[PDB]
Symmetry: D2
């Protein structure tokens, strides 16, 4: 059971992928600092992680506020003593509309949470890892960043930005024994947020998907070679691999988790 | 002269690549709407363009203001009647510092001008191109967005965003006879933008470049297979190719202009 | 009308893309050396080119035979004096079958004609260009090389090899004022090639396409954002662009011609 | 210990990466079927594997001979009963020379061993895996296939072919619960295969490296962000990740193991 004595700051920890990844890292003996802007979801997640029997604490923090991020990371360093791993995962999906009708205020919001916020967290945590001369970081990008999808102007651009940020961060931090990589999930389901993407692409009425949500879900699944959307639980193991020693000579890489 | 009869809106038109491209398109016959936030630069550029024998006009506009962009685009349409081509090129280079010390305010600034501003222009202009059922767009990305460079966290992420946005826009706009592509210049020189980069990279003291500017320019040119930086004038032709009919079945692509 | 005085060796010249491209280069004043193994196709192609009014000669040659290629290039050099351009285009589509039943002999044949054969030509011709300290080369790859398609194991591998060979050759030949690039056409129609692709994909019965050829054609067209296959006449201008001076700082690049 | 009861066929099992990978898989409880053309290296390699306390057997076989490949695979299924995992790794490094001087016989030999032979193995084994409706495959590509390197025309081309072939095979075999992925090692040292690369690049005297072998080695390490070549033992864990359940929703992907 590796990761014993390791500490991981998970952002967006109250959400689907963040909670699922925290549990896996915990099951592995990792101590977890949960960070999310959503208090209710945060505490519900903290409870599920505590059972795993590892040390764990929560921090309500809006990553777009750098002052709140810096204070929170400092409280984390104070509460756990160090931050070995970072799963820089908080994010917002954005509206769905073709570019000519894309809500402009929403576009800046997507960039601010997904890029600037992810950067606030990476910067503050990286300074700490530098003092430790050790650290492994995984940034959550997306297949939308690998190839811009229809009606997702903002999100796609935010995730493509994350992929480049990951490469630049990998180069800057390499000298301090820190590695930085990214994961790019494709269609993940079910539950919800899969339903959001299905309903909202359907509502657009572009040539890319039907306006019938049941039909859209089939077109999306139908595009995956494995012919299923992925289960949220198929992501934590990729994260763990990128944080652990088997990826020791890997940095600056982006792993599609998309069924082909 | 192809392009005879066409109208191209060029943003960042008072700057290096923007002016060079405007001139080349004017030599081919296209009327030019120049857009830049720098009035002094615009005016010198507008006079050079008119020397080529086409109609040319200037619009002082900060692309970060959507209200200014929409106002300007409307005036461009009132003055020229249409907008056939768009060279979405205004940009800011950003600071040079490793990620752990990257100025946070600058980070948001780079993203707002390079991604949100670029998006404001793309949205307003594509609305007009849809009305025409005709449009060709070229977004200026960068080799920095193709692979994130050291000490350029914000700039590389902004151009990685432009590459994905170009893909999404291409998908969204294909049904209306609009194509959307990008160019990704590598090391281009001489001049102070080339000098700013040599100088500011040298200043960081990172492992990637010497602290001596003469050695940094050597290291940069020495990383290019053609062993020379590119001339700014080796960009206009590429933009013209992506706007004209020789690229009629290409959209959503990104062209490296980098020497190998 | 540039290319006056230029000499272009086109392989696969009797073929569709080859003849289309030779005509366009002839229209720009370039003299054409036509190379193909198919004599009937060649003579009809040559007649079409001469009609353009430029110097032209045909060479029956099987590119898989290095000795035939060497002797042929020597003859083109005596007959025209030099070889400024090369469109390394001859190719074979291969069988269509899922990998577990892909015909092994055919697999080897696809690699020999599409890779080894293109390499024989590229080597022989680059020697002449180094002697002239000038040359521009375009290799015909394919979207199947950019992303391996279903049931096309050999063809995809052959074009993915062409994309790498193009990058190495660009590096190797850079010091001699030689540029080497590639084009990657996607779906092209109508005609024999298109009919074959559709028909043979339908016959496989794989999950990727309908078993009814009428539907398979619609599915292929349907996968394209521009919602049409491309016309081979949308390829010559791209080759011409990669050969001429507007691409002067571009080498080692691969241009998708795929509709999105 | 996952993989208890698993059987993995490893080709090039007498070589560095193949032996290192089989040992790691044996430590996880995997029975190894070692395949190579060199009997003596197989003997030593199998000796090392046995010592991990798992069932292991060796097979002398030239992957370029399809008849030998099918016969060997049948024997493996007879001796172990099934083939759950495949590490398709045998390969030949090729000559080192600028394309214009690349030895043509060697060019073909490289393709035949690295592509056709890997294909022979992939085909025969996928047929078995289809029978089980279960299989995980890892093909060894290389960073040379990700971007064509100077003086390695044949090798880069063969590895670019492997990456495309990996994508096609992932599509073809996905319906039978089989996944196919690749790894792309960068600079791996020390040893004599690394020394061979260093010595032969130095020998070419191209502009890409020093002519002094000692300096070449430093230039290669210096191009790595992590500033060190990777250890061969930093590859096994990646292959194991790609064969195990943590990569359950990943197929058609290529993982660089290159230091940045
Ligand atoms: N679900 C998918 O299919 C999918 C695919 C690709 C990428 N992703 C990405 O994975 C990550 C996690 O996504 P999910 O699937 O877990 O969704 P999710 O909504 O359940 O979780 C995202 C979490 O981040 C939090 N968050 C949002 N804005 C924040 C802010 N300003 N400060 C702090 N926390 C904030 C939310 O409150 C939420 O708990 C995101 O980056 C998302 O874009 C998801
Ligand atoms: N020079 C290079 O080597 C290089 C390499 C890769 C990409 N680029 C990109 O090419 C484009 C043109 O760059 P350059 O080389 O021409 O530099 P430049 O500074 O000369 O021109 C950029 C121009 O955009 C304008 N601009 C900046 N912010 C603006 C705003 N908010 N609103 C309106 N105009 C604004 C500036 O006033 C300037 O005239 C940029 O997007 C740049 O990032 C340049
Ligand atoms: N047509 C398409 O849809 C398409 C799509 C992607 C890539 N391509 C590639 O474009 C190129 C030309 O395609 P096409 O559409 O023109 O096909 P085509 O069949 O019309 O012509 C190919 C030509 O090459 C010649 N040729 C084949 N083997 C040869 C050999 N050993 N020696 C000399 N000549 C030989 C043929 O005789 C023929 O004249 C090929 O490399 C092909 O794979 C075509
Ligand atoms: N060493 C590196 O730095 C590096 C980097 C990228 C990719 N690779 C690739 O990784 C794989 C492993 O290579 P290595 O590093 O282990 O070198 P290696 O020489 O130690 O092992 C290659 C093994 O394959 C065998 N082989 C060669 N031709 C064969 C044939 N026709 N039939 C059966 N077996 C054959 C060899 O005899 C040898 O045992 C190769 O595909 C190689 O090209 C290696
Ligand atoms: Mg990108
Ligand atoms: Mg015909
Ligand atoms: Mg490739």
């Amino acid at each position: 059971k590796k990761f014993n004595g390791k500490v991981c700051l998970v952002t967006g920890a109250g959400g689907n992928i963040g909670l699922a990844t925290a549990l896996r890292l915990a099951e592995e003996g990792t101590a977890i600092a949960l960070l999310d802007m959503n208090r209710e979801a945060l505490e519900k997640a903290e409870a599920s992680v505590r059972e795993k029997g590892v040390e764990a604490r929560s921090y309500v923090c809006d990553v777009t506020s750098e002052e709140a991020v810096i204070g929170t990371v400092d409280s984390v360093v104070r509460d756990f003593g160090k931050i070995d791993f970072l799963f820089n995962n908080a994010g917002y999906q954005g509206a769905f509309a073709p570019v000519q009708d894309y809500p402009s205020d929403d576009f800046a919001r997507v960039l601010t949470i997904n890029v600037t916020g992810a950067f606030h967290v990476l910067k503050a945590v990286s300074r700490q890892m530098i003092t430790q001369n050790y650290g492994r970081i995984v940034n959550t990008a997306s297949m939308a960043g690998v190839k811009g999808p229809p009606n997702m102007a903002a999100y796609g651009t935010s995730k493509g930005a994350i992929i480049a940020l990951t490469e630049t961060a990998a180069l800057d931090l390499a000298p301090y024994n820190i590695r930085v990589n990214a994961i790019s999930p494709g269609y993940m389901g079910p539950g919800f947020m899969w339903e959001r993407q299905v309903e909202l692409q359907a509502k657009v009425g572009s040539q890319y998907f039907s306006t019938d949500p049941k039909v859209v879900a089939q077109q999306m699944i139908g595009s995956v070679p494995m012919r299923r959307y992925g289960d949220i639980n198929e992501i934590p193991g990729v994260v763990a691999f990128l944080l652990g020693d088997d990826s020791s000579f890997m940095t600056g890489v982006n792993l599609p988790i998309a069924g082909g």
